[PDB]
A paper describes a structure:
Eukaryotic RAD51 and DMC1 both catalyze strand displacement and strand exchange. RAD51 and DMC1 are members of the RecA family of DNA recombinases and share ~50% amino acid identity and similar biochemical properties.
As the binding is not sequence-specific and as there could only be one mismatch in 15 basepairs (Oligo 3/5 with an A–C mismatch in Supplementary Table 2) for obtaining a stable mismatch structure, the densities of basepairs are averaged out in both homologous and mismatched structures. Even though the sidechain of Gln244 in this duet is somewhat far from the phosphodiester (4.4 Å for homologous and 4.2 Å for mismatched DNA) for a direct interaction, its functional role in stabilizing DNA backbone cannot be ruled out considering the moderate resolution of the cryo-EM structures and the change of sidechain orientation in the DMC1-Q244M mutant and WT RAD51. The results taken together support that DMC1 can tolerate mismatched dsDNA by stabilizing not only the basepairs (by providing space for misalignment) but also the DNA backbone, as proposed in the structural model.
Numbering used by the authors:
A (entry chain B), B (entry chain A), C (entry chain C): 22 to 276, 284 to 337
DNA sequence: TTTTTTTTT
DNA sequence: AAAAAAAAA
């Protein structure tokens, strides 16, 4: 899986450790970089980069899979449950495995309570043979109270010390620190192959809407957000992990609410779960922009223990 | 149809297998390449390429067809239906057969639901004697859930295993991998003559808007998109297949929405179908830039089963 | 903690006093500024700012803390009590230490009486080993009667002259004077390290709702309020101090009351305490938007001596 | 050719 | 039941 199949196929050793300096560590990682962004890396020409692409092209089929073959090749995908069976039948078993899942709400709709539940119920063996693994959590506002994890872990009856161990944690401080933090994500997914299951970014747009002005720096903002969302799509298919992201809302005095991000974020997201408030601690959850499931509604219970019924 | 009529017309055998190395496999394929791009191929001079163009020019008429002759010669064209009779009377029978058809929407307007329907209703014998054939699908975002094909195939009452067999599938990963994937398309159209009917690119501009910067690399981007769209126009007339492409949108703070691509994509496209959202699961479809049909509107129903009424 | 670790790591002396001119005085302060807002400062290029970010990156771990490590690293946080044990069991021990706490009421609900109590009960050694320290108070309406502090200090039996000494005071006059007053806050937190515990802004939105018009200058107002609230989040984690803010209310003729600020203020606030009036001098306090504590209610007594039972 | 922001009473 | 303004690559 890692880059040593090219040594027996016409590539010497003096560039394998030079390609590993930028972040490329997988054979499919060479399939995902352009030939123009392999020259501006630190010390390679145009004459010797052509013989790397023909070296990698013999290892994977450059052909056309039949749709019957892709049906079995779409059995890598797991479905990570939420904590309530009314929210998983809505989503269709849980969260997808090679995709980006969005969720947005007003202000008290339970976004990080949905995030804090997933830090517990992804370490548990669910349906379909999903084994469970460790969890990357990139917090961005402040909200990673870890004693709330010890409050949800008791209703699933798991040990306290062995549920606070599989959650790796790192806080971003600005918009570019959120982008340079994805390099250590791709390394930790790669050096320990097969024991990571999801990646949670607590809010993508909580730092872009503050580090940029209004109409002046709008075009640089969406051209920097698109470079980040495409990198997350490649990470979620390199190592087959789920991605769950949340974002906030804004008003509309031109005509009520709508999520921020624009058309860049709405297109690059696979599923979007709207969230609003009901009576007491019930919450209503709709479905926006799903490839498979239709638009229905469900109900929550944000109790001590995350999401319930 | 293939290149062996030149052997009896002054061309030896030592270049026929040398022209087949680049991709030229048809007599009309020599009519579509320049005399300047036949020298930079791998091993031919200027003195021996002149005697190939005079060898091919005696086989097809270098004259002027009367418009009465071209009327019968425009009876190769079929029309592939959508799934609703309100959307085919708008388009004028369905999708054109020697052309490029575009469709763009906001984010939930049902673009890949329109694409997933065409993977089923092109294997069915429709009106005008259209027999039905296999389907090339080039996905670019992630969205080729094949179990949705088993959900539309039941409302047309066809067998499940014989509808998952005629869909060949390949995913592009970068912008140049999307261009080098068209070589295997032209070979698979050629080696099995007459059993392919359409080609679907899921999004052209979902990879160009991310692999290029703003005003810096704008001119290289549109000069690489124009090389791809012209290649698709030649493929759609070599083997007489339909081309259906989709693309996304952007805002306009200078003055609402407009499709990306610029003037290169709007000129090289034959028909453009705008798509917006109505109440519930109704959608409204307009017509932009059609050579034949006027500007009208229709209505959809994106149910389990693709497009309905 | 201050910026002298870079002198032994490839940074000369000619920019350390030039970075101190804008406000950057801590090693983590370089972790919180962008690379784009380090060029427009007064005299630095793009070629010499790259070697500052690599100089600071070796000092702190650019890695991933385990959640067991972050549990001990969340023991910096203290909890500043209010004055009644019914309001601290509701909040969960008191006010948070790395967060922004909001409180809103109708007009007589006791917002500045809640603020005037905190100027006294933060100089007292409470539970959990909280030592007590000095207090920054940014008043914005007019309401900092200091003889009310001598009325609450007697029920805690502390000396009068040594409770009027630890309260530094400054009044803002317009919206931008409220923003330029935070520069002297960050300097006074830095030059006397470890003897400041909270920062009180008396009202954020008492000056934004008057210096701006209706729908005309709405977008500039929320784009200037978001620049201020993010700066307060960084201050509250640079030096580990609490932030307590209050704001007012408005009606709703479209359909009763709701707090001003919009979705910018509701998202950037960590905890919100609603306040209403009961019979006599009892007041009722609810909880809006808390990461840890559920929605319950309590009771007050605004007597001579601040908040009681 | 590119790119959406923001509730008041 | 009514009210709009914002630009740089
Ligand atoms: N232990 C708990 N038991 C019950 N409800 C709780 C508990 N902790 C928090 N809540 C509720 O959960 C809600 C807060 O959810 P939260 O995860 O903060 O959503 P949020 O949208 O991220 N808030 P914000 O990030 O500011 O927009 C509030 O209604 C709290 O009252
Ligand atoms: N089985 C189904 N029944 C009914 N509606 C469905 C079904 N599956 C998906 N939908 C709806 O179809 C819409 C999604 O259409 P889609 O094909 O994703 O358009 P799209 O523009 O390609 N989305 P995107 O590519 O991100 O822009 C959503 O409104 C879904 O709720
Ligand atoms: N010495 C005192 N003893 C008891 N109650 C007092 C005393 N001084 C003031 N109050 C009460 O405190 C209340 C005013 O508290 P205050 O914190 O000023 O509310 P407020 O919300 O700030 N008013 P405003 O700023 O205009 O919204 C009134 O009900 C007064 O009667
Ligand atoms: Ca939150
Ligand atoms: Ca799609
Ligand atoms: Ca007051």
């Amino acid at each position: 899986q890692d880059i040593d199949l090219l040594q027996k196929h016409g590539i010497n050793v003096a560039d394998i450790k030079k390609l590993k300096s930028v972040g490329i560590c997988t054979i499919k990682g060479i399939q995902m970089t352009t030939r123009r962004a392999l020259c501006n890396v630190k010390g390679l020409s145009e004459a010797k980069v052509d013989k790397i692409k023909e070296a990698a092209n013999k290892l994977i089929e450059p052909g056309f899979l039949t749709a019957f073959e892709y049906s079995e090749k779409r059995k890598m995908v797991f479905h990570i449950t939420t904590g309530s069976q009314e929210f998983d039948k809505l989503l269709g078993g849980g969260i997808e495995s090679m995709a980006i899942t969005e969720a947005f709400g007003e202000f008290r709709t339970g976004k990080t309570q949905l995030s804090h539940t997933l830090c517990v119920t992804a370490q548990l063996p669910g349906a379909g043979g999903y084994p469970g693994g460790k969890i990357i959590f990139i917090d961005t506002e402040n909200t990673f109270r870890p004693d709330r994890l010890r409050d949800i872990a008791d209703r699933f009856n798991v040990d306290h010390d062995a549920v606070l161990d599989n959650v790796l944690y790192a806080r971003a401080y600005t918009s570019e620190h959120q982008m340079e933090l994805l390099d250590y994500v791709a390394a930790k997914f790669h050096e320990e192959a097969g024991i990571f299951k999801l990646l949670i970014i607590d809010s993508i747009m909580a730092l872009f809407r503050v580090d940029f002005s209004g109409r002046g720096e709008l075009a640089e903002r969406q051209q920097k957000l698109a470079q980040m969302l495409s990198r997350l799509q490649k990470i979620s298919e390199e190592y087959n992990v789920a991605v769950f992201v949340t974002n906030q809302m804004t008003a509309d005095p031109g005509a009520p609410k709508k999520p921020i991000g624009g058309h860049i974020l709405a297109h690059a997201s696979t599923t979007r779960i709207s969230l609003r408030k009901g009576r007491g601690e019930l919450r209503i959850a709709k479905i926006y922009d799903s490839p498979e499931m239709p638009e229905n509604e469900a109900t929550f219970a944000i109790t001590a223990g995350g999401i319930g019924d």
